[PDB]
């Protein structure tokens, strides 16, 4: 109940940007599907590839938050 909590809370500010990126990703997938449905599995594929970065980064931030909450 000191500075470790404050740091682990400030670490969580990146999740907003990560969520905005995920929203952009899946909004683009939605638009591409509405335009040309016949390549759904492709757009979805690339979307998952993008998540393979974005998710990873967010999880990193969460871990570092816990690391600063129990350093």
């Amino acid at each position: 109940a000191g500075v470790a909590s404050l740091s682990a809370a400030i670490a969580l500010m990146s999740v907003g940007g990560v969520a905005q990126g995920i929203g952009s990703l899946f909004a683009a997938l939605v638009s591409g599907t509405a335009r040309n449905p016949s390549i759904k599995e492709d757009l979805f594929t690339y979307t998952l590839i993008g998540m393979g970065f974005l998710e990873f980064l967010g999880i990193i931030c969460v871990l570092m938050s816990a690391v600063l909450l129990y350093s």
């Binding site: 998952l48 393979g52 990873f56």
Partner: protein, 74 residues
């Protein structure tokens, strides 16, 4: 400075799968150690399967970047 940049990129692309296999593994291990009931376990099985797929994705990404970084013309 370019050598330092390149080695940083290379090592990150090399350890990405190790991270996905080890640290997320430790997190899953914590959850396994803490959970007891059956409903939560049923729901957590799917998280484990997701981690499997995610690991294979990270491995594909690393393969791509490593064939890019270890390709020489001559």
């Amino acid at each position: 400075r370019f050598y330092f940049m390149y080695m940083a990129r290379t090592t990150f692309q090399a350890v990405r799968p190790l991270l996905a296999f080890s640290v997320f593994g430790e997190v899953m291990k914590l959850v396994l150690a803490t959970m007891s009931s059956g409903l939560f376990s049923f729901l957590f099985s799917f998280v484990l399967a997701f981690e499997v797929f995610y690991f294979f994705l990270q491995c594909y990404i690393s393969y791509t970047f490593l064939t890019m970084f270890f390709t020489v013309l001559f």
